[PDB]
Each structure stands twice: as structure tokens, then as C-alpha cells.
Amino acid sequence: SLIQFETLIMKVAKKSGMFWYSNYGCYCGWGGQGRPQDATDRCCFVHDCCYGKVTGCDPKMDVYSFSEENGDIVCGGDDPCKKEICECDRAAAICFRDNLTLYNDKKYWAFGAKNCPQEESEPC
Numbered sequence: 001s002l003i004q005f006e007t008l009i010m011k012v013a014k015k016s017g018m019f020w021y022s023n024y025g026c027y028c029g030w031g032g033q034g035r036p037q038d039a040t041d042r043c044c045f046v047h048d049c050c051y052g053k054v055t056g057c058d059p060k061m062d063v064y065s066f067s068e069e070n071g072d073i074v075c076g077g078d079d080p081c082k083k084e085i086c087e088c089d090r091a092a093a094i095c096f097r098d099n100l101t102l103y104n105d106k107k108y109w110a111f112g113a114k115n116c117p118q119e120e121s122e123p124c
């Protein structure tokens with residue numbers, strides 16, 4: 001669920017999703033169009049595409065299971081579809097953590113729709 005995605009961002013990237021990734025660039029926020037503007041924005045774009053490929057369950061609402069083990073987040077449970085959602089959230093949390101060197105809200109927060117042209121939308 002989205003609450004769990006916020007939780008994974010806090011655990012992995014040591015940052016809040018709502019404070020740092022909810023309106024950054026073209027894609028770190030709900031939906032999106034245009035080009036991923038930088039490495040953090042591309043992490044959100046891939047997360048959108050991953051969610052778009054989940055068939056059978058709901059990435060917003062459904063609750064997945066995970067454990068911390070061997071220094072990593074391990075997605076689990078008995079449901080393949082819910083584990084797919086967890087994998088999308090875990091990959092994006094690690095992607096955020098790994099691209100903190102580049103993060104730049106001064107340049108990219110509330111980047112604006114003109115800057116994210118419908119015609120430049122990179123396909124998944």
C-alpha cells in the first residue's frame with residue numbers, strides 16, 4: 001500500500017516520501033508525462049511503469065508482507081501479485097537512496113507541466 005511505500009523510503013533512503021518525492025520533476029508524484037529529468041525522477045518513472053504492469057491486485061490499497069534480513073528488504077507473503085507490488089516499492093526505495101548524491105529539489109520541485117510535454121513522454 002502507499003503507506004508501506006512511504007515506510008520503505010524511510011527505512012532505506014532515510015527520507016520521507018511525502019516530503020521529498022511527492023512533486024519532484026515530471027514523475028515523482030502521481031502520474032506524470034514528459035522526460036524523467038534526472039536520476040531521482042527516473043526512479044519514479046520506473047516505479048510508475050512497475051505499478052502499471054501489476055495485474056490482479058492494487059498497488060495503492062493492497063498490503064504486502066516483508067522482513068528485514070541479511071541487510072536487505074525481503075518481499076514475501078503467499079500472494080505473487082502483492083509480492084510484485086512490494087518489489088516495485090523496494091526497488092524505488094533503493095533507487096532513491098542510491099541517487100541522493102544527485103537530488104536537487106531547488107531545481108526540480110514543482111517542475112511544472114509545460115516542462116513535462118505530453119509529446120516527450122518516454123514509454124515504459
Ligand SMILES: *CC(=O)c1ccc(Br)cc1
Nearest residue numbers: 022028029030044047048
Ligand atoms: C511510483 C512512485 O515513485 C511515485 C512517487 C510518488 C507518488 Br505521490 C506516487 C508514485
Ligand SMILES: [Ca+2]
Nearest residue numbers: 027029030031
Ligand atoms: Ca509519478
